[model samples]
Target: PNSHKEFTKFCYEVYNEIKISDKEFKEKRAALDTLRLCLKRISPDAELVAFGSLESGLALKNSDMDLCVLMDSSDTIALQFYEELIAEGFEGKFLQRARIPIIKLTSDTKNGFGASFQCDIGFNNRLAIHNTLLLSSYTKLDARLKPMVLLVKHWAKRKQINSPYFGTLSSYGYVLMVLYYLIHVIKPPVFPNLLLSPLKQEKIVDGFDVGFDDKLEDIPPSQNYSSLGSLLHGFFRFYAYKFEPREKVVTFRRPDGYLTKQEKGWTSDRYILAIEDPFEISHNVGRTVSSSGLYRIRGEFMAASRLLNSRSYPIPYDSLFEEAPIP
Candidate 1:
């Protein structure tokens, strides 16, 4: 549920007022048709699915659909085909300051369309086999521990919270907020009100693969804090998570299986890919995108330094780690 009565009311008006302009609506449909053709040509091992803001039901007027061309990490041929598109016509773009590969194409109408309409395409190759596109570096953790993510993101957005420096409002911010919300506010015997609830209670249950039906208020206390914390404690603990594990060298390979040796600064400081989805629409996990057997991608990205061959993995999205209460 959204908070701030005044803000909430304002949001509704803004949301309700946001009817797609004729141009956007036309692009939306054209985008879908183009994607269908693209898929046929690429023929990924699994069906490609759409995700992100559009799938999350939070797209804005100018937001292009966030689509993901995915397959299991084990699938080589399919991933190679997806890569071919990336090397060629895809135009890259930015959204909220993130680099996602983008493609915009216009085709002529056989009839009197007067002019060709354009479609915006974006891509997010999974970080590993099953991880959500951008969170955990470990696919197993991602696929298996995802509950907390959606919850945290929703909580942060509704609170209008931001990073400590308030530079941006993003899923990462919400994740930190959630971790802190649990670490300090939640307790062992008595989990936070939100933790342990059914996956459905979170914003997008149908998107994930699990369900829940319990309450933590009745449990004993464990670890967390109070008014003195202010999410700082939570944020710090959040960083303590096992993403790029401290002891191992992880790395990824191109679709061609040609990977560079691990070495310091061998990779760019930041990895960038433009992401647009042909089918992104109000829930990354729900609808046809994920259920239709799409979203599987095989690839790799490593945490190599000029000196180490860091361990790499395909993104994973199998669990909802959020259910564990920090308290």
Candidate 2:
């Protein structure tokens, strides 16, 4: 049956279509450069470095830019930067509530960017820059990883589970879930766990040693050359049947795939899903997921598992990706 081939091809096609185009990428870079130049004029001591999906090469069309600000003074610099942006007629907001303030800027709509175009600028979030670099490196290590990630991300978006503020998972958490399955659950692991053990090649950035050097083509592929269709099936099945999401913490850094809630002192505190950040080991990336959100996530896993597993070769390509009904 051509279903396997058809589904695999379909996944790749979606990947190609969903990816940020070259022109868009160039425009995004130009926009960031312009913003950085403006910032420099406001405060010579401040620096802006891009992070998030853009840096990780997993961005979708019109994805928001995430910038980490390195500055000697957050409040004063942010106030000045905010005032400058206002003076320049750019729509932006300066939030100075936290120890590290944030400035969010809207893109110029007349320049062909989408209506949703926005950028987040924050300080002392250097770990995000390091994490982005790590994921970007892994994307280079395996060609299959990106397509699988792109599909999973798209699936999350469609299923409405990709919002931290809405009591669900972040895109970061979902990516980590996929990475954990590949590195730990699947036979002949896809991507080696970057944080499992210390390396002589580690670099201490901010406060975490994020030095990982599994260069592209340096690591051999896993024996499981499974097709995209099969991998997608397995991803849902793995999470649906095997993963103890609420029971165990998904810790990618440890040699073992997970850490117990008891072991991590994370049994309570209303954390419906516990996923440890690779660098910020104490931070629970899934802390934002409420109890109801956890239920919805697990239900989606069950639904996808049943949907995929019940299919014969040349599965229902269209319906598999059809958006779920609103809850």
Candidate 3:
């Protein structure tokens, strides 16, 4: 997969667009460094990781790194612990918002940077519990799959895929395209990058005995385009059989940045995964639920519109659901 090549170039454009300064770059790096050390303090065995475009080498200047501290549990206690760690950095900024932690901060330096660091650092221990499976931490798939994801991403861009949020049907249709492409289609089909590559010297997800053979299978002959129907059946066949739970280890994630510690070059067993997201720009304002016959999006979206009109992907279902929690 040309993931490394293409994603690296995408960031060049992003870095160029943001007009980011050297000092700010250092600050971000230092922040990440601080974050890494902090996670260890919480739990040395915590899966110290960073995902998002920043980790995958495709970040723009405006992109924020999605740092994670992978844990075994996703129950409320663990959730609160992760939340507290993120909240500690907020200090005196916490604002009461109904029941949610709302911390707001702003930059007022006249001679400093423009705009405040408007970001969210929420902690979620959403592991693939009982009915879930990891991407196979010990497999040869990691290498082949990593690049395959980038290829699908590039394909979506070319196809001008849209989020299904606008119409109930399109909400996650785009993700379906990628999933279908990999799970149902493609001869010797590729897997996600996390599974394709040997990350941090360890497989991204820990493997189980005959886990691959027994547990998962192709999706049944329900809806994945009759031809792809066989693909779906194969999908379930692959996932249904030997997906061992106790045998399955937790997900160990990774950052997108190649630089973990200065010159180390992509070290750290953190699994570098990618979201096969379909929305060119995600809906944060609840436009997906708006009753507008036609609502307005930003100029970036309009331009994105023109670019995608030529290859609009048909919505196969009423809102795609991401089966995996936080991939």
Candidate 4:
């Protein structure tokens, strides 16, 4: 039906289905421990820390494990570790050409870990851990934020636009976009500007202010009582029609929320979708989005908005998440 309650119910059902369970959590934890032991064997001083969706509480079922090797070591150590992984029969690639050289593992079995999951191991990625904590904090601010983020992430994955490697935006980029909408774009603001709040403690990481008011108790509750269905519809509609992609940058870093491409010097054509990373202010999280990719993403937003507005008796969630054929 076209009812908001019914649509929200449908979203919750999908969310519950896709959210990671306790059994899977323990299994993943054990896998991490196995990897940690392996890494420690190589670099005795190195520490293996988890980041990304798994640590941020936004992970969907079967989400890849993102880990960072923290140590007072050099890139040579990372390369050596990568080589060791290959010798240990891990099936993946060591991306030496990347800005931050990382080891990507896709294999399921390694030293009887019984882990059937993909993983990305980066070296000295301290900023990512902070970013993950920021995301985790925002999810706890409002009950609606998590489901909305999960739904948007799920939608992007199904539409095949969640891959940064293929000229589309990453799941991290989509999360920023959703946060921007909730904190700045949406009327009555579903989320408080966590980074800008005065209560936030100052901390410098990677030369950036990776600080935010993580104390959820101090945050004021949102006055906007919009239902989940209405909020989701509004999210798509805002991106589809209201957002001036060419002129504006999707950012919640400022109080006014009027960050522009000209101001940021992101006037180039490659900045198709400028989504500023909250902590890493200089980085455009949507830098991977190509011109054609932006066009396709906008088309999907339009389609989703129209579908949500339809007078159908039942919400067509299957249609919403149906995988689009690769172009």
Candidate 5:
């Protein structure tokens, strides 16, 4: 049905089905604690901080665990932890050739849960922790933010736009796009740009200016409390018709800047999507989006906008994420 309340209710139902249960939460928490202690044992100064959807409270039942092992010596500490975990009977792989070594552990034995779980342990990734806090703060500012993000993440996964390895955007990129729509495209923004406003302090960490806080107490009263259904429809519409993806950069930090691709020197023909990292200004999170991938993404945006707008009765329960044609 087209009833806003009905669509919101439908989203919640799907959200509940995909959300991680309490039992799973406890199990994962215990497991992470164990891993933290294990890493400490391996190296006295090694720090393991969880980030991403799991730590940010937006995790789904099958969401893979993410942890960044921060240490003065990343490569050494990462390899040591990888070997130790393997010797301790965990199924793990260590890739040492990258700019930074990474370890992936697939077994759930270290965790309290018995189900299959994958944990990606990377080194010197402090920026991810800060970004996680940024995302968490947005969710707290508005009740609709979390459910809308979850729904988009689920839809992106269905439409096959959630994988950077497959020439598309990562889940994080899609989340950024959703935030951009709410913050910049809508008439009255649902959430303010916490990063852009004056902040209490600033600092440089890991070669990046790790400033900007999502001050929960400082959240301005929102002017847009639109229903999730309407907001979601607007989201698709914003991307499909309004966003000049090819020319402009989606800079969340300095939303007022409206930085152009030419200004950022992101004029390369290959860089189809340019989403500036708020903390890491030099980093373009959308560097992986290929031409064909962007073609599909824009198509999905148009299709979602059309589908939601065309529905008269309550939208069919299963049609929420019916895939759009790639061409």
Candidate 6:
């Protein structure tokens, strides 16, 4: 197996290669500006805000932007906005069946940005914005957190486990899983539970406590000295072998951050992977993952753990993210 030092170096190298660059950031900003100006023309009272990975600093080079329209309007307004985009000859789809209808837009050859970009526009997703801020806080707390999340996301994408529509987990769900490992799973925790900190003040949003201790300066650094490679290996091993998906719920908000399926009234068989949403406690972010999807996910976790624990010299680092074949 490769030495920990070499593996850690490789992790940083890949992270740097895939993370959003300044040039890419400018391009995304330009795309946002184009959308914002168009929305301004349609409804002067409406406001478009960015959230998700783009705002949380966890964005990969090609990560799609998540935007929310802050207008106190109904689905009709969303439909009108979608129609306007279609009239402008933009490539996109309107998902009206969702609880909150979404406008999925893509920049293709017909767009002026001169680059392909994808964006999902939702109406009044205040909780999502708050969660993004929470993630941003965690990412800023430690240098290791970002790389660990980015690599896991990249790996999940390559392995084809990042799609929630097709019965797998969402990228956001995966991010929360990584946070669970960093904050609660590991010894000498890498991150202090921001939600559990006494410094946090309560503010209700959508019937959930959306407040957290944002005073990052006052928080002391972690005592854990584990290298990035070791932490990554431990993460895979934990999920693959240690985590009891059937009996336990993954959470970061509670004092111990661990709950049982029965305790949470989630004893139903449909709850294959119960990852409680940080703000939406009653919601399971992993609810989309089917039994088959979990099988595939767990298989990938096992393979990744073995790959990292291999005794071969100069392990095939690239192989860890090799594109999985579609069944």
Number of the top candidate by lDDT? 6
Give RMSD (Å) of candidate 5 vs. truth. Answer: 2.4
Number of clashes recorded per candidate: 83, 1, 50, 2, 5, 2
Off by over 4 Å in 2: 1-3, 72-75, 107-115, 197-202, 214-217, 311-314
Query: lDDT: which is higher, 2 or 5?
Result: 5
Please provide, for model 2 over 100-145, each residue's C-alpha lDDT reduced to its tens digit, 9 standing for 90 to 100. 6888886453444444668898876888987898788788877788
Off by over 4 Å in 4: 1-3, 83-89, 108-110, 113-116
The residue ranges of model 1 lying beyond 4 angstroms of the native Cα positions read 1-9, 18-26, 73-195, 198-327
Query: What is candidate 3's lDDT per residue for 1-327, written digit by digit as tens?
Result: 113233334423433444435665676666556555655665666664544434433333444445444667522333444454455452224344545342233322232233455433333412222012232221132333333333333333333333334321221232333343454334454343232233313222233211122122331222222222233223323223322211221121222211122232322322121112212111111223222311221222233323323244442211111121210
Question: Can you give the lDDT of residue 100 in candidate 1?
Answer: 42
What overall lDDT, based on C-alpha atoms, would model 2 receive against the true structure? 0.78
Question: In model 3, which runs have C-alpha deviations exceeding 4 angstroms?
Answer: 1-27, 35-49, 56-61, 68-118, 128-176, 192-327
Please identify model 5 stretches exceeding 4 Å from their true place. Answer: 1-3, 72-75, 108-115, 311-314, 323-327
Q: Supply candidate 5's per-residue lDDT for 90.
A: 81
Worst 10 residues of 1 by lDDT: 297-306
Clash list (residue pairs), candidate 4: 1-313, 1-314
Q: Please provide TM-scores, in order, for all candidate models, with all chains considered together.
A: 0.34, 0.91, 0.34, 0.92, 0.92, 0.93
Position 192, candidate 5: lDDT: 76
Question: All models: lDDT?
Answer: 0.32, 0.78, 0.33, 0.85, 0.80, 0.87
Model 4 Cα lDDT, one tens digit per residue, 1-327: 233787788888898988888988888898798788778778888999999988978888877889999987445778888777777767777887746688888785447544466889988899999999988888777888788888999999899888888989999998888888888887888888888898889999879998888889877888889888878988899999999999999886779788899998999536889998888888999999998899889999999998887776665766998888987
What lDDT is reached at residue 202 by model 4? 93
